[PDB]
Amino acid sequence: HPAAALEPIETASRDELQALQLERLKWSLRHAYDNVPHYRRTFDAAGVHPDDLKSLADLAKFPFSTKNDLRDNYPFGLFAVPREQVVRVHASSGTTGKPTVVGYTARDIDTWANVTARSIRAAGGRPGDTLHNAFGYGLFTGGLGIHYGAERLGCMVVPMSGGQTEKQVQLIRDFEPKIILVTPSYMLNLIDEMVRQGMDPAESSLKIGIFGAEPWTQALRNEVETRVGIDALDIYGLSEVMGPGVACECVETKDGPVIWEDHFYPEIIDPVTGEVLPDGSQGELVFTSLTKEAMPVIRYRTRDLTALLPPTARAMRRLAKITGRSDDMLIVRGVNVFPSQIEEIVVALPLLSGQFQITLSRDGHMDRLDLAVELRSEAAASVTDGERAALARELQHRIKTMVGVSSGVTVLAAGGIPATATGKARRVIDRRQ
């Protein structure tokens, strides 16, 4: 429409694809090196120059980037263009109170829309389909990324965003979307609300669900597909690389997300040593962007554990199950949360010692985050019961506001959280299984 068709590159030969990748990879390395002081330093210190890349395998010579490099160059230090050529910024959780920040040229936004349209098409969406977009609109990459891709595909986009459960179901009923884009966790909430409204979940217009932003199981898939009468497809990404639409599953094979590696070049490494592993081996997923202008990323470590699998329905490889992470990051209802994020907010309250413990659990199918924090000892003496309840509320509101997750808060006497014999607490107890 024109976007009903596959792009030529989607069905290109392995040779054609690898030639394109090599030509873009040379450009992207040199773009990074010339235009981003950090990469100039980081390459120089590693003894490597862009010229050193003669073949795809030569990528292993180049250093890794991580979340720390963004943190150390906040807010815009990793831009490879002047800010006056940057039309979009997006923001998500960092390890400190400064968000992780990414920027995009006009071309970058166009590229993003194109791969996100490609993803929705791979999953079976078409021009003219009504599409219910329940990913968060705003600083998160999910909502706006899915928005542009769907609009580029010629879908009728319902910009629902991520809350208002009764209204979600009202509009699914009234607007009759064929496609829903939503976290897998919130999809379950929506099914529950259909039931409470007297709507059998299989009596909906939906034929396709495209789920991402967090891991989900085969069992969740079977449960959604069966109850709602849809094909459910897996859409992957992360803000640093672009957003959603880094990889997406094809409905013809349903055999895991296809990585759009004409744009986003994947490697798998041992998470401990950093050595590159052969395709089929489980390790940590690393990306190098091939077409990004504003913020090229070079061997960016996702911390996601997975594996690369051979091409099937496309010219490109696939991801295996994403089985966890190699850092301490939590995802709650699609929202990235670091324990250190919470710590910073906890310590900011002068009545609290800084001692804290997050317990994650499952209440039915819903994740629950519960936060215990300790008073300073001098404070137990003087803080009233009403004062410590308000302290709990205030802490809950700041975490909701600054991190973006809802949490139960409990305020304990000093020593109230079980510690090592010298006072060290386990920061995260995840019982969600």
Ligand X SMILES: Nc1ncnc2c1ncn2[C@@H]1O[C@H](COP(=O)(O)OC(=O)Cc2ccccc2)[C@@H](O)[C@H]1O
Among residues 224, 235, 330, 379, the one that binds ligand X under rule CB under 6 A: 235
Task: Name the amino acid, one letter, at 216.
Answer: W
Single out the residue of 111, 114, 110, 103 nearest to residue 141, CA to CA. Answer: 103
Report in angstroms how near the CB of residue 88 gets to ligand X at its nearest: 14
DSSP 8-state assignment for residue 349: S
State yes or no: residue 202 binds a second copy (CB under 8 A): no
Of 108 and 304, which CB lies nearer to ligand X in the complex structure?
A: 304
Count of beta carbons in the 10 Å neighbourhood of residue 124 = 19
Stretch near Mg ion under the rule CB under 5 A, chosen from 123-131, 196-204, 219-227, 307-315: 196-204
**For 43, how many CA atoms within 13 A lie in the half-sphere containing its CB?**
22
Q: Pick out residues in 97-116 that bind a second copy (CB under 8 A).
A: 97-98, 103, 106, 109
Q: Is 375 helix (H, G, I), strand (E, B) or coil?
A: strand
CA dihedral 69, 75, 80, 86 (to 10 degrees): 150
Q: Provide the terminal-to-terminal Cα distance of the chain, rounded to the nearest Å.
A: 44
State yes or no: residue 229 binds Mg ion (CB under 5 A): yes
Stretch near Mg ion under the rule CB under 5 A, chosen from 200-208, 211-219, 253-261, 424-432: 200-208
State yes or no: residue 204 binds Mg ion (CB under 5 A): yes
State yes or no: residue 21 binds Mg ion (CB under 5 A): no
- Binder of residue 64, out of a second copy, K ion, ligand X, none (CB less than 5 to 8 A by kind): none
φ/ψ (deg, to 5) at 386: -65, -35
The alpha carbon of residue 119 and the mean position of all alpha carbons in its chain are separated, in whole angstroms, by 15
Q: Is 241 annotated as a binding residue?
A: no
Stretch near a second copy under the rule CB under 8 A, chosen from 168-176, 207-215, 336-344, 365-373: 168-176
Report in angstroms how near the CB of residue 308 gets to a second copy at its nearest: 32
State yes or no: residue 161 binds a second copy (CB under 8 A): yes
DSSP 8-state assignment for residue 17: H
State yes or no: residue 275 binds a second copy (CB under 8 A): no
Instruction: Please identify the residue of the shown chain whose CB is closest to the bound ligand X.
Output: 212
Among residues 159, 215, 415, 416, the one that binds ligand X under rule CB under 6 A: 215
Among residues 155, 213, 345, 403, the one that binds ligand X under rule CB under 6 A: 213
Structure tokens at 205: 């217009």
State yes or no: residue 232 binds Mg ion (CB under 5 A): no
Of 189 and 204, which CB lies nearer to Mg ion in the complex structure?
A: 204
Among residues 50, 94, 124, 142, the one that binds ligand X under rule CB under 6 A: 142
State yes or no: residue 157 binds a second copy (CB under 8 A): yes
- Please, are residues 160 and 133 in contact by the beta-carbon 8 Å criterion? yes
Q: Is 355 helix (H, G, I), strand (E, B) or coil?
A: strand
CA dihedral 40, 46, 50, 53 (to 10 degrees): -160
Report in angstroms how near the CB of residue 181 gets to a second copy at its nearest: 14
The whole-angstrom separation of Cα 398 and Cα 406 is 10
- Please, are residues 395 and 409 in contact by the beta-carbon 8 Å criterion? yes
Task: Name the amino acid, one letter, at 131.
Answer: L
State yes or no: residue 130 binds Mg ion (CB under 5 A): no
The whole-angstrom separation of Cα 165 and Cα 433 is 25
Report in angstroms how near the CB of residue 213 gets to K ion at its nearest: 4
- Binder of residue 206, out of Mg ion, ligand X, K ion, none (CB less than 5 to 8 A by kind): Mg ion
Q: Is 228 annotated as a binding residue?
A: yes
Question: Residue 364 to residues 153, 192, 276, 419: CA-CA distances in angstroms?
Answer: 37, 11, 40, 29
DSSP 8-state assignment for residue 137: P
* Residues in binding site for Mg(2+): 204, 228
Which residues are near Mg ion by CB under 5 A? Answer: 204, 206, 229
Which residues are near a second copy by CB under 8 A? Answer: 74-75, 82-91, 97-98, 103, 106, 109, 127-128, 130, 137-139, 143-144, 147, 151, 154-161, 164-167, 170-171, 174-175, 398, 401-402
